[PDB]
Enzyme design. Structure first.
Site, short mmCIF file in Angstrom:
data_model
loop_
_atom_site.label_atom_id
_atom_site.label_comp_id
_atom_site.label_asym_id
_atom_site.label_seq_id
_atom_site.Cartn_x
_atom_site.Cartn_y
_atom_site.Cartn_z
N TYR A 99 0.83 -1.20 0.00
CA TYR A 99 0.00 0.00 0.00
C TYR A 99 0.86 1.25 0.00
N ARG A 119 3.68 11.18 -9.13
CA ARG A 119 2.87 11.73 -10.22
C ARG A 119 2.04 12.92 -9.76
N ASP A 133 2.20 16.76 -11.25
CA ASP A 133 1.05 17.58 -11.63
C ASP A 133 1.08 18.93 -10.92
N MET A 150 1.30 22.69 -12.58
CA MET A 150 0.31 23.74 -12.32
C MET A 150 0.98 25.01 -11.82
N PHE A 202 -5.35 19.35 -13.00
CA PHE A 202 -5.78 19.59 -11.62
C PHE A 202 -6.81 18.55 -11.17
N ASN A 248 -2.68 -1.16 8.19
CA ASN A 248 -2.48 -2.58 7.89
C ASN A 248 -1.23 -3.10 8.59
N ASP A 281 -3.00 -11.65 12.46
CA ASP A 281 -3.40 -11.19 11.14
C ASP A 281 -4.68 -10.39 11.30
N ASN A 289 -8.20 -8.71 2.68
CA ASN A 289 -7.16 -7.69 2.70
C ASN A 289 -6.41 -7.65 1.37
N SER A 345 -8.65 -6.18 -1.32
CA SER A 345 -8.78 -4.74 -1.18
C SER A 345 -7.57 -4.03 -1.77
N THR A 350 -7.54 -1.35 -5.03
CA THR A 350 -6.84 -0.07 -5.07
C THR A 350 -5.91 0.00 -6.28
N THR A 388 -11.85 -0.13 -0.67
CA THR A 388 -11.81 0.72 0.52
C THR A 388 -12.90 0.32 1.52
N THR A 424 -11.86 -2.84 3.17
CA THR A 424 -10.82 -2.56 4.16
C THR A 424 -11.43 -2.01 5.44
N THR A 445 -11.45 -6.56 12.80
CA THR A 445 -10.17 -6.96 13.37
C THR A 445 -9.97 -6.34 14.75
N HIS A 477 -16.69 15.02 3.29
CA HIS A 477 -16.10 15.43 4.57
C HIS A 477 -15.68 14.23 5.41
N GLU A 511 -14.49 11.71 4.37
CA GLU A 511 -13.23 11.28 3.77
C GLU A 511 -12.04 12.00 4.39
N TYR A 535 -11.88 13.32 7.30
CA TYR A 535 -11.68 12.84 8.67
C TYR A 535 -11.11 11.42 8.70
N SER A 593 0.06 10.57 18.31
CA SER A 593 -0.03 10.16 19.71
C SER A 593 1.09 9.18 20.06
N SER A 621 -9.44 11.31 27.61
CA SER A 621 -9.87 12.50 26.89
C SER A 621 -9.57 12.38 25.40
N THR A 676 -10.52 18.39 18.33
CA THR A 676 -9.21 18.50 17.72
C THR A 676 -8.26 19.34 18.57
N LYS A 683 -7.13 17.30 21.42
CA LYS A 683 -6.05 16.40 21.02
C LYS A 683 -4.72 17.14 20.96
N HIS A 704 -6.05 26.41 2.79
CA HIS A 704 -6.52 25.75 4.00
C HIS A 704 -6.41 24.24 3.88
N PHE A 705 -6.96 23.68 2.80
CA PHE A 705 -7.01 22.22 2.77
C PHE A 705 -5.65 21.63 2.44
N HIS A 706 -4.78 22.35 1.73
CA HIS A 706 -3.40 21.88 1.63
C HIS A 706 -2.67 22.01 2.96
C1 LIG Z 1 -20.71 -0.08 30.11
C2 LIG Z 1 -21.01 -0.94 28.87
C3 LIG Z 1 -22.45 -0.68 28.39
C4 LIG Z 1 -22.55 0.73 27.73
C5 LIG Z 1 -23.65 0.73 26.64
C6 LIG Z 1 -25.05 0.88 27.30
C7 LIG Z 1 -25.44 2.39 27.40
C8 LIG Z 1 -25.92 2.91 26.00
C9 LIG Z 1 -25.65 4.46 25.89
C10 LIG Z 1 -24.54 4.76 24.83
C11 LIG Z 1 -23.11 4.54 25.47
C12 LIG Z 1 -22.59 5.90 26.07
C13 LIG Z 1 -21.04 5.82 26.29
C14 LIG Z 1 -20.71 4.94 27.55
C15 LIG Z 1 -19.28 4.34 27.42
C16 LIG Z 1 -19.27 2.91 28.06
C17 LIG Z 1 -17.80 2.46 28.31
C18 LIG Z 1 -17.26 3.13 29.60
O1 LIG Z 1 -17.84 4.05 30.08
O2 LIG Z 1 -16.08 2.64 30.20
C19 LIG Z 1 -14.91 2.96 29.47
C20 LIG Z 1 -14.10 3.99 30.23
C21 LIG Z 1 -13.31 3.29 31.36
O3 LIG Z 1 -11.94 3.16 30.95
P1 LIG Z 1 -10.77 2.95 32.14
O4 LIG Z 1 -9.79 1.95 31.75
O5 LIG Z 1 -11.34 2.35 33.34
O6 LIG Z 1 -10.05 4.42 32.47
C22 LIG Z 1 -10.89 5.56 32.67
C23 LIG Z 1 -10.21 6.54 33.67
O7 LIG Z 1 -10.71 6.29 34.97
C24 LIG Z 1 -10.53 8.01 33.27
O8 LIG Z 1 -9.61 8.89 33.89
P2 LIG Z 1 -9.46 10.42 33.24
O9 LIG Z 1 -8.69 11.31 34.11
O10 LIG Z 1 -8.63 10.41 32.04
O11 LIG Z 1 -10.98 11.05 32.90
C25 LIG Z 1 -11.15 11.70 31.64
C26 LIG Z 1 -12.36 12.63 31.68
C27 LIG Z 1 -11.90 14.06 31.33
O12 LIG Z 1 -11.13 14.58 32.42
C28 LIG Z 1 -11.91 15.32 33.35
O13 LIG Z 1 -12.35 14.79 34.32
C29 LIG Z 1 -12.18 16.84 33.10
C30 LIG Z 1 -13.67 17.03 32.72
C31 LIG Z 1 -13.78 18.05 31.54
C32 LIG Z 1 -15.15 18.80 31.60
C33 LIG Z 1 -15.50 19.37 30.19
C34 LIG Z 1 -16.51 18.43 29.46
C35 LIG Z 1 -16.23 18.47 27.92
C36 LIG Z 1 -17.56 18.19 27.14
C37 LIG Z 1 -18.28 19.55 26.83
C38 LIG Z 1 -19.83 19.32 26.74
C39 LIG Z 1 -20.56 20.71 26.76
C40 LIG Z 1 -22.09 20.50 27.06
C41 LIG Z 1 -22.75 19.65 25.93
C42 LIG Z 1 -24.17 20.21 25.60
C43 LIG Z 1 -24.70 19.57 24.29
C44 LIG Z 1 -24.19 20.37 23.07
C45 LIG Z 1 -25.25 21.42 22.65
O14 LIG Z 1 -13.35 12.17 30.80
C46 LIG Z 1 -13.38 12.75 29.50
O15 LIG Z 1 -12.55 12.48 28.71
C47 LIG Z 1 -14.52 13.75 29.12
C48 LIG Z 1 -14.77 13.72 27.58
C49 LIG Z 1 -16.21 14.26 27.31
C50 LIG Z 1 -16.39 14.66 25.82
C51 LIG Z 1 -17.76 14.12 25.29
C52 LIG Z 1 -18.37 15.13 24.26
C53 LIG Z 1 -19.27 16.20 24.98
C54 LIG Z 1 -20.79 15.95 24.67
C55 LIG Z 1 -21.41 15.01 25.76
C56 LIG Z 1 -21.74 15.85 27.04
C57 LIG Z 1 -21.59 14.95 28.31
C58 LIG Z 1 -20.09 14.84 28.70
C59 LIG Z 1 -19.97 14.35 30.18
C60 LIG Z 1 -18.61 14.82 30.77
C61 LIG Z 1 -18.08 13.76 31.77
C62 LIG Z 1 -16.89 14.33 32.57
C63 LIG Z 1 -16.21 13.21 33.34
O16 LIG Z 1 -14.97 4.94 30.77
C64 LIG Z 1 -14.57 6.29 30.52
O17 LIG Z 1 -14.39 6.66 29.42
C65 LIG Z 1 -14.37 7.27 31.72
C66 LIG Z 1 -15.63 8.18 31.87
C67 LIG Z 1 -15.72 9.16 30.66
C68 LIG Z 1 -16.92 8.78 29.76
C69 LIG Z 1 -17.17 9.92 28.70
C70 LIG Z 1 -18.68 9.94 28.34
C71 LIG Z 1 -18.89 10.40 26.85
C72 LIG Z 1 -20.21 11.23 26.76
C73 LIG Z 1 -20.97 10.95 25.43
C74 LIG Z 1 -22.49 11.15 25.67
C75 LIG Z 1 -23.17 11.63 24.35
C76 LIG Z 1 -24.64 12.02 24.61
C77 LIG Z 1 -25.57 10.93 24.01
C78 LIG Z 1 -25.64 11.11 22.48
C79 LIG Z 1 -25.51 9.74 21.79
C80 LIG Z 1 -26.15 9.80 20.39
C81 LIG Z 1 -25.58 10.98 19.61
CU LIG Z 2 -15.75 19.30 5.27
#
Ligand SMILES: CCCCCCCCCCCCCCCCCC(=O)OC[C@H](COP(=O)([O-])OCC(O)COP(=O)([O-])OC[C@@H](COC(=O)CCCCCCCCCCCCCCCCC)OC(=O)CCCCCCCCCCCCCCCCC)OC(=O)CCCCCCCCCCCCCCCCC
Ligand SMILES: [Cu+2]
Ligand code: HEO
Ligand SMILES: COC1=C(OC)C(=O)C(C/C=C(\C)CC/C=C(\C)CC/C=C(\C)CC/C=C(\C)CC/C=C(\C)CC/C=C(\C)CC/C=C(\C)CCC=C(C)C)=C(C)C1=O
Ligand SMILES: CCCCCCCCCCCCCCCCCC(=O)OC[C@H](COP(=O)(O)OCCN)OC(=O)CCCCCCCCCCCCCCCCC
Ligand SMILES: CCCCCCCCCCCCCCCCCC(=O)OC[C@H](COP(=O)(O)OCCN)OC(=O)CCCCCCCCCCCCCCCCC
Ligand SMILES: CCCCCCCCCCCCCCCC(=O)OC[C@H](COP(=O)(O)OC[C@@H](O)CO)OC(=O)CCCCCCCCCCCCCCC
Ligand SMILES: CCCCCCCCCCCCCCCC(=O)OC[C@H](COP(=O)(O)OC[C@@H](O)CO)OC(=O)CCCCCCCCCCCCCCC
Ligand SMILES: CCCCCCCCCCCCCCCC(=O)OC[C@H](COP(=O)(O)OC[C@@H](O)CO)OC(=O)CCCCCCCCCCCCCCC
Ligand SMILES: CCCCCCCCCCCCCCCC(=O)OC[C@H](COP(=O)(O)OC[C@@H](O)CO)OC(=O)CCCCCCCCCCCCCCC
Ligand SMILES: CCCCCCCCCCCCCCCC(=O)OC[C@H](COP(=O)(O)OC[C@@H](O)CO)OC(=O)CCCCCCCCCCCCCCC
Ligand code: HEM
Ligand SMILES: [Zn+2]
Lengths: 98, 184, 658, 262
Positions: free
Chosen positions: C61, C71, C75, C79, C103, C124, C135, C142, C145, C149, C201, C204, C211, C284, C286, C288, C299, C315, C359, C362, C419-421
């Site tokens: 690949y 090539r 081009d 240009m 182009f 891969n 594998d 694989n 695919s 390409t 693609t 893949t 995998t 878009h 694409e 990402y 990382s 995070s 981003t 990150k 920008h995109f370059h």
């Molecule tokens: C369980 C299996 C079954 C599950 C399936 C069944 C349920 C079905 C529901 C769907 C599944 C939901 C996801 C669940 C994951 C299950 C796996 C699991 O949890 O364990 C793995 C994993 C465990 O791994 P580990 O080996 O044990 O190590 C973990 C360490 O302990 C960690 O240590 P650390 O120090 O590194 O902590 C890092 C900490 C970051 O470090 C911090 O503590 C600083 C906190 C920063 C605060 C700023 C928040 C940034 C987000 C801004 C949002 C603005 C408001 C949004 C308003 C809406 C927009 C208009 O966490 C973060 O990275 C925060 C990133 C949040 C960005 C998400 C995008 C924002 C929109 C969602 C708003 C809700 C966000 C809640 C914030 C939670 C804060 C803890 O769990 C974790 O990831 C740790 C908890 C963090 C979970 C993040 C939750 C993501 C929120 C997405 C919700 C989207 C809304 C619904 C829409 C969906 C359709 C579109």
């Molecule tokens: Cu775009």
């Protein structure tokens, strides 16, 4: 893996949910809005019936990733279709001789 | 490795679902682009579509019967149910080809208008999927007859089960969105 | 019997294109003759072409990507020269009929056959090793695919000497790309190259997704996978969800061109705005897909060469997931100016600038990985730092374009080109070079030359800035993209500076070629004996360099993130297993190459309307598929003696090192 | 990079001026966070280089709630502000939105051809190729369509571009704050003649000069009184010189659009 009984249940449910919309549209059973809502709702229910009875969709197969993939795909399809329809409706409206 | 293959085929089917969704969106956008030609109400013969729907549903149920027979380790019943499923799918395809031929010979083909283009694209893509499923089913029947219900063939039966049932689900969407909504 | 194909398809009258065709033919003859003279045809066929080993396929690949980069850059140079000449008040040497081809082909090549194969090949090579798998889930898939390409690459390159390529831009907007306004074969070359490559693609994407989900080593939970694996998983999710969009959109364009349908025509109920909507709904995701894997690469490299844990792992992972989800709800920012109205434009601009937050998360997580570390300035780390700077600038300009009011005056301007370059070169190209340098010892067993690598980096970054900052300025001065003739003289100074920047980039590419040559020449003095040249942290560094064809004699068991680093810290690395067991492996297959050859024939026949040949090609594809389905012997067991021998040589190396 | 006297950074139209303000505001807001990122990249590279034995080394420091909170929140605040400004300006700068102005707008109908710009002044009963005039400080209402393929009607120094699609009408409102001659282009590649799809937008000092321009166009020996004349003009050509037509057929723009809506 299902069984004969669940397959026949899905068969009968699909037959009912297919016959009713066709009869409603063919015979003008109700108002256009009622007909549309009924056929769309029954189509969705029949899709669910097929996913459960025939495809044996469940939250445990493939560590739950089967269901996760299906739900994510449905969300992506909703985004694509609804966004395209909305965008094109707005574009076509803005393309008119007004 | 069978479970991995079946899961991978499920993922591929999700991608196929998105493909069909794009076709559905195109049809929704172009449904009214009839360009002074026929509309859906002028060409959709609902009893025909109902017969086609029943053929596809019967094929889905017969494939379920084939899968049940497979889990009972009965090669002959598996083959017989697969043959009946193949016949029902072939009937669906024949009806669809007849409909398309009728539209084409009457100057109502895809080149007539955007609506007819979209209708042909969506329904014919579904038909192409059904035809691929039928070729796959024929190959699988021959392989099962040659070597029985090996693990390879059981995995293949499961993958084709997913494909065939998914085709009938897509057809549910198709008849609802295209035929019933156009006829109403 | 030949459809439209005729001697007139060959552009004899064109001296530049004819010289290029002769040069490519001579190079191909030279390669064939060298392979013949060294008698490596059997080795090639048995070890690379039919290979189902993910490491060989990843290398192949990347080889395809680098050759096509040559090539694409030719081009770009053409240009730049044409624009410099045309802004001086001269005809230049590329009339519109050739420049527009150039182009369009540059865009298609750089996207689908340079950027995509590079990231795909890196994934891969790396992903199975990082998760402790032997594998990918579907090895034969694989191989197939990769060969699809190659089918696309062949078709786009054949368009050089037979007929011509599309002159529509790299996304072929109708009705310009429709049969009425593009009656030639170019759009058909575009169509079939893209369709045939997109099949591979999509496969893949499915392969890598399954995998990562299913073939991870025991104990490696999702949140213990390396970040590069997370990025690859998200990229493959995007591939699976988005490339069907491209398949359908190109198929509808194909129906419009071949069967006279009215999906995108001006009249009869067609609507070309739908094509623009669909193509960008694919488009878009694409970009990402391209950027996420290199985020993973950066990382890994930053953690390794900071001698420090990656900062904010959780995070980072959730930012990747967020970008993945949001990449599907922003695509209208590519046609803000089509006239969708304020509500739609505002909504999509807001979603576009929202997806910029993860981003930045990150970028700052990488910065704090470097914070209070011990930074070794390996060329890979130089690529990483340069990426941080350059991609920050590029993403800033992208966010600016996300504001519809500004896009109204910057759309399709050279500001957009810049920008995109900026994002593409600063992120994808930089990360591809960084990952290539980082994993070259793993792929081949010796290190690249660092002097020429650093020279290549400096040429690339400085040349990028010199080449594309004037394009930001030109965008502000009102210069639009895809201009080739009688360019307004006030753009001339910026265009000259851009040409000089392009020359600097050419020097960077020359430095890369010299680096490869010198590294291969002096490979015996730069061997990677232990398999861990950089003091890495993930499982790929736990194997030998190159890894054994089966990756791991024993599937490792992981307990934490950075499993190999923890093994080294606990003294558990390089422990001879008590006993070995036979390993199930897939056999090499020529079926993929045969299917791809039939697909190439089918595409060429469809391009030239050779219907009988197209039928033969399609039937060949399907029949080969079925025949392969009848194959039973598709796997074999590696004897324990072979595994013992390989592991003993590796352990002798480990003991000699220390 | 940029240019102080550039079309977008030195606009002569109200729409362009607002767009310049929007661009500068977004640039500054984004710099607030972009400049720290670049400075931190370089400064961390230098300070924590492996050579430096004095700098603190923390190999196992991988999580910090405070740092993660700051890096998440700062972009969130920046983007919230940017999104509010985006909503407001997108609704304020909507191309189809008529401008608030005392003077009555002048309607100019725009038809992109292969490969030149055809303009119709329905009220003045004239048409032109690759040249438009209008009074300065007078809003101009642009009705835009295409005869063959996608184009983008764009006068960079005045403001927003807008796509031109066959069988479709797009609307653009512009105004010139100062008199002058402004370069016009197509911003959407439309084929081999694309490079030559340039026109001039002449903003006259007052309505008397625009009336003189209209009268000069009215003495053209050529007319556009039939669709056959339009089709003759629409035959593919490149680098078209400025031409004037008198007695343009009424509803010619409507006829061009209706050609594709049968
Ligand atoms: C369980 C299996 C079954 C599950 C399936 C069944 C349920 C079905 C529901 C769907 C599944 C939901 C996801 C669940 C994951 C299950 C796996 C699991 O949890 O364990 C793995 C994993 C465990 O791994 P580990 O080996 O044990 O190590 C973990 C360490 O302990 C960690 O240590 P650390 O120090 O590194 O902590 C890092 C900490 C970051 O470090 C911090 O503590 C600083 C906190 C920063 C605060 C700023 C928040 C940034 C987000 C801004 C949002 C603005 C408001 C949004 C308003 C809406 C927009 C208009 O966490 C973060 O990275 C925060 C990133 C949040 C960005 C998400 C995008 C924002 C929109 C969602 C708003 C809700 C966000 C809640 C914030 C939670 C804060 C803890 O769990 C974790 O990831 C740790 C908890 C963090 C979970 C993040 C939750 C993501 C929120 C997405 C919700 C989207 C809304 C619904 C829409 C969906 C359709 C579109
Ligand atoms: Cu775009
Ligand atoms: C892989 C490549 C790639 C990547 C990664 C991106 C990333 C982004 N792009 Fe770009 N793009 C790419 C490649 C392309 N873009 C295009 C077109 C395009 C357009 C359409 C404009 C038009 O047509 O007129 C817009 C509006 C954007 C915006 C954005 C944004 C907001 C991001 C964001 O993802 C970037 C986020 C990153 C940032 C901001 C930098 C780091 C962040 C910092 C420093 C901290 C946080 C800062 C803030 C919160 C501001 N892009 C086109 C089409 C070209 C064509 O038409 O031919 C291509 C090819
Ligand atoms: C429009 O064309 C343009 C471009 O594309 C837009 C360019 O690439 C370029 C720049 C080209 C560069 C120098 C880039 C060089 C980079 C190279 C070395 C990498 C290219 C990769 C290749 C090795 C191709 C890989 C794929 C192949 C193996 C597929 C084979 C395709 C082939 C060679 C083309 C088919 C040509 C035919 C056989 C011609 C038919 C022959 C005739 C009957 C008679 C021929 C007579 C002559 C005089 C010999 C120019 C000149 C251009 O103007
Ligand atoms: C156009 C839209 C349709 C495109 C084709 C999509 C159909 C193929 C879907 C693939 C499903 C993957 C699911 C995973 C799976 O089930 O694994 C089976 C196998 C890969 O498993 P593997 O271990 O590698 O090898 C075993 C066989 N020797 O997988 C396989 O071996 C079968 C897949 C390989 C065959 C692909 C054939 C390419 C399609 C050619 C038609 C092109 C259309 C031309 C357009 C005009
Ligand atoms: C806008 C839309 C435009 C796009 C249009 C799209 C049109 C095409 C849509 C249909 C796509 C068909 C998908 C076919 C799915 C078959 C995939 C498959 O092979 O199943 C995997 C299964 C796994 O078992 P395995 O042991 O690993 O064998 C692998 C193969 N050796 O392997 C098996 O079970 C064995 C399978 C044997 C091979 C059967 C192949 C039959 C299908 C051929 C497809 C072409 C049919 C042509 C249609 C008529 C054209 C006029
Ligand atoms: C991937 C996208 C999928 C979209 C599919 C729809 C596009 C195809 C439309 C047909 C082409 C246009 C008409 C040209 C032909 C034309 O205009 O000529 C008219 C012709 C009738 O004349 P005859 O050829 O019969 O006359 C010949 C005699 O006079 C002498 O022998 O129509 C046909 O026979 C075509 C009917 C085919 C109908 C079946 C095909 C339907 C599509 C496939 C559906 C899937 C199932 C197939 C499984 C086998
Ligand atoms: C694009 C078109 C490609 C051509 C497709 C058709 C392929 C024709 C060959 C198939 C029949 C081979 C029968 C084997 C018969 C057999 O057993 O002997 C094949 C024989 C292998 O022997 P070796 O070269 O290893 O030497 C043997 C000694 O080592 C002693 O054992 O090779 C040849 O003599 C040439 C065959 C390949 C010739 C290459 C074909 C041209 C390819 C051009 C592609 C461009 C270059 C890029 C390459 C990466
Ligand atoms: C898009 C793909 C285009 C091709 C890319 C360029 C690669 C060309 C092939 C390289 C030369 C291979 C040299 C073999 C080297 C060689 O000696 O063969 C090696 C191999 C085994 O021969 P041995 O005598 O070593 O026997 C060893 C035994 O133990 C059996 O394993 O022979 C084969 O099985 C046949 C392989 C050649 C045939 C493969 C190519 C044919 C498919 C491609 C063409 C399409 C056909 C359909 C069109 C209608
Ligand atoms: C601002 C934008 C907002 C973005 C929010 C997005 C939320 C994403 C939540 C995803 C649902 C997760 C539920 C899995 C539930 C499940 O069955 O998995 C269970 C799985 C647990 O795996 P393990 O048992 O190996 O343990 C991992 C750890 O949880 C143990 O501490 O949960 C996860 O950790 C997954 C993490 C999310 C990774 C998401 C991957 C990508 C999702 C898309 C996959 C479908 C693709 C289909 C192709 C068409
Ligand atoms: C009308 C003109 C017909 C010319 C067709 C040209 C056929 C040439 C075949 C070359 C194959 C090269 C073998 C390499 C050897 C190699 O390594 O590949 C072997 C590979 C798979 O073979 P196996 O399953 O035995 O596996 C062998 C190894 O791969 C072990 O893993 O390919 C085949 O054997 C498939 C055969 C396809 C046969 C295609 C039939 C022709 C289709 C066209 C018919 C049109 C009819 C129209 C009806 C509407
Ligand atoms: C190596 C240095 C590169 C240079 C000097 C370069 C140069 C340019 C130039 C001059 C154009 C035409 C700009 C305009 O219209 O005036 C352009 C277009 C483009 N480039 Fe690049 N490029 C480079 C690398 C790449 C890469 C790596 C990619 C993508 C992976 C890429 C993708 C594109 C695309 C998509 C277009 C738009 C083609 C379109 O018109 O349809 N470029 N390039
Ligand atoms: Zn429109």
């Amino acid at each position: 893996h299902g069984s004969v009984k669940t397959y026949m249940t899905g068969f009968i449910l699909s037959i009912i949910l297919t016959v009713i919309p066709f009869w409603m549209v063919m015979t003008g059973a109700a108002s256009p809005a009622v007909i549309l809502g009924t056929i769309l709702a029954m189509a969705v229910v029949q899709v669910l019936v097929h996913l459960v009875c025939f495809l044996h969709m469940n939250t445990k197969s493939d560590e739950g990733w089967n269901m996760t993939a299906f739900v994510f795909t449905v969300l992506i399809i909703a985004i694509l279709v609804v966004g395209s329809i909305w965008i094109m409706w707005n574009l076509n409206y803005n393309m008119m001789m007004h | 490795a069978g479970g991995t293959k079946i899961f991978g085929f499920w993922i591929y089917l999700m991608s196929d679902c998105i493909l069909f969704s794009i076709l559905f969106a195109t049809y929704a956008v172009l449904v009214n682009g009839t360009a002074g030609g026929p509309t859906g109400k002028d060409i959709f013969e609902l009893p025909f579509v109902l017969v086609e729907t029943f053929l596809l549903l019967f094929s889905s149920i017969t494939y379920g019967m084939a899968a049940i027979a497979m889990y009972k380790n009965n090669k002959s019943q598996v083959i017989s149910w697969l043959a009946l499923t193949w016949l029902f799918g072939a009937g669906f395809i024949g009806m669809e080809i007849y409909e398309f031929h009728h539209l084409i010979v009457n100057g109502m083909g895809p080149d007539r208008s955007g609506f007819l283009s979209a209708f042909f694209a969506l329904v014919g893509t579904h038909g192409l999927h059904v035809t691929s499923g039928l070729i796959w089913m024929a190959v699988l029947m021959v392989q099962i007859a040659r070597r029985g219900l090996t693990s390879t063939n059981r995995t293949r039966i499961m993958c084709l089960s997913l494909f065939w049932h998914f085709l009938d689900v897509v057809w549910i969407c198709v008849f609802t969105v295209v035929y019933l909504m156009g006829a109403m | 019997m030949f459809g439209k194909l005729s001697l007139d398809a060959v552009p004899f009258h064109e001296p530049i294109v004819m010289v290029t065709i002769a040069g490519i033919i001579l190079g191909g003859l030279a390669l064939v003759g060298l392979i013949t003279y060294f008698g490596k045809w059997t080795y090639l066929w048995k070890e690379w072409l039919t290979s189902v080993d993910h490491k060989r396929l990843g290398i192949m690949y990347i080889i395809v990507a680098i050759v096509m980069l040559l090539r694409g850059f030719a081009d770009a140079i053409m240009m730049r020269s044409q624009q410099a000449l045309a802004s001086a008040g001269e005809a230049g040497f590329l009339p519109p009929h050739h420049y527009d081809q150039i182009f369009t082909a540059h865009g298609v090549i750089m996207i689908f056959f340079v950027a995509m194969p590079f990231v795909i090949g890196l994934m891969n090579l790396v992903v199975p090793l990082q998760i402790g798998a032997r594998d990918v889930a579907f090895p034969f898939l694989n191989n197939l695919s990769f060969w699809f390409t190659v089918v696309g690459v062949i078709l786009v390159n054949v368009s050089l000497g037979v007929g011509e390529f599309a002159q529509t831009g790299w996304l072929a907007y109708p009705p310009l790309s429709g049969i009425e306004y593009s009656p030639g074969v170019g759009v058909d070359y575009w169509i079939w190259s893209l369709q045939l490559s997109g099949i591979g693609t999509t496969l893949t994407g499915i392969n890598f997704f399954v995998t990562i989900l299913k073939m991870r080593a025991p104990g490696m939970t999702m949140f213990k996978m390396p970040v590069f694996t997370w990025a690859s998983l998200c990229a493959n999710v995007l591939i699976i969800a988005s490339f069907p969009i491209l398949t359908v959109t190109v198929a509808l364009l194909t129906l419009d061109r071949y069967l006279g349908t009215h999906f995108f025509t001006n009249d009869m109920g067609g609507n070309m705005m739908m094509y623009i909507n669909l193509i960008w709904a694919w488009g878009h995701p694409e970009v990402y897909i391209l950027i996420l894997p290199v985020f993973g690469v950066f990382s890994e490299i930053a953690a390794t060469f900071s001698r420090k844990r990656l900062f904010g792992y959780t995070s980072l992972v959730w930012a990747t997931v967020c970008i993945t989800v949001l990449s599907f709800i922003v695509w209208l920012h590519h046609f803000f100016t089509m006239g969708a109205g304020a509500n739609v434009n505002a909504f999509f601009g807001i979603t576009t600038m929202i997806i910029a937050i993860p981003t930045g998360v990150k970028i700052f997580n990488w910065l704090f990985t470097m914070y209070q570390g011990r930074i070794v300035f390996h060329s890979a780390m130089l690529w990483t730092i340069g990426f941080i700077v350059t991609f920050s600038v590029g993403g800033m300009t992208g966010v600016l374009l996300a504001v519809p009011g500004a896009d109204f005056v910057l759309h399709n301007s050279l500001f957009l080109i810049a920008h995109f370059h900026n994002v593409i070169i600063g992120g994808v190209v930089f990360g591809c070079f960084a990952g290539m340098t980082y994993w070259w010892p793993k792929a081949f067993g010796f290190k690249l030359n660092e002097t020429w690598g650093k020279r290549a980096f400096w040429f690339w970054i400085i040349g990028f800035f010199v080449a594309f900052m004037p394009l930001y300025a030109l965008g502000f001065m009102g210069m639009t993209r895809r201009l080739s003739q009688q360019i307004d003289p006030q753009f001339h100074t910026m265009l000259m500076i851009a040409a000089s920047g392009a020359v600097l980039i050419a020097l960077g590419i020359l430095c890369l070629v010299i680096q490869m040559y010198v590294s291969i020449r002096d490979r015996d003095q730069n061997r990677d004996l232990t398999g861990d040249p950089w003091g890495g942290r993930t499982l790929e560094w736990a194997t030998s360099s190159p890894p054994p064809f089966y990756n791991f004699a024993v599937v490792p068991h992981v307990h934490e993130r950075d499993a190999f680093w923890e093994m080294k810290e606990k003294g558990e690395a390089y422990k001879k297993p008590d006993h070995y067991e036979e390993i199930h492996m897939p056999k090499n297959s020529g079926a993929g190459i045969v299917i791809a050859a039939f697909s190439t024939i089918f595409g060429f026949a469809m391009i030239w309307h050779i219907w009988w040949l197209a039928i033969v090609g399609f039937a060949g594809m399907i029949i080969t598929w079925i025949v392969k389905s009848f194959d039973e012997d598709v796997d074999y067991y590696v004897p324990v003696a072979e595994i013992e021998k390989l592991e003993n040589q590796h352990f002798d190396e480990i003991t000699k090192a220390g | 990079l940029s240019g102080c006297n550039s079309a977008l950074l030195d606009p002569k139209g109200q729409i362009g001026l607002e767009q310049r303000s929007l661009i500068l505001t977004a640039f500054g807001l984004m710099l607030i966070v972009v400049i720290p990122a670049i400075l931190m990249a370089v400064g961390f590279a230098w300070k924590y280089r492996a050579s430096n034995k004095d700098a603190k080394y923390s190999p196992n420091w991988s999580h910090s709630n405070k740092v993660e909170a700051v890096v998440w929140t700062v972009p969130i605040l920046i983007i919230i502000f940017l999104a509010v400004l985006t909503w407001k300006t997108t609704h304020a700068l909507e191309p189809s939105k008529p401008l608030a102005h005392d003077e009555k707008p002048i309607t100019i109908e725009v038809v992109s051809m292969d490969w030149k710009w055809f303009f119709i002044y329905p009220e003045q009963g004239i048409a032109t190729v690759n040249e438009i005039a209008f009074p300065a400080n007078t809003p101009v209402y642009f009705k835009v369509t295409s005869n063959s393929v996608m184009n983008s009607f764009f006068i960079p120094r005045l403001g927003s571009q807008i796509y031109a699609m066959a069988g479709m009408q797009t609307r653009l409102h512009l105004i010139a704050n100062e008199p002058g001659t402004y370069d016009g282009i197509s911003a959407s590649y439309s084929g081999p003649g694309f490079s030559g799809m340039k026109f001039k937008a002449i903003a006259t000092p007052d309505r008397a000069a625009f009336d003189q321009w209209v009268a000069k166009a009215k003495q053209s020996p050529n007319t556009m009184s039939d669709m056959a004349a339009f089709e003759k003009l629409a035959a593919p050509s490149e680098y078209n010189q400025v031409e004037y037509f008198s007695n343009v057929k009424p509803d010619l723009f409507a006829d061009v659009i209706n050609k594709f809506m049968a």
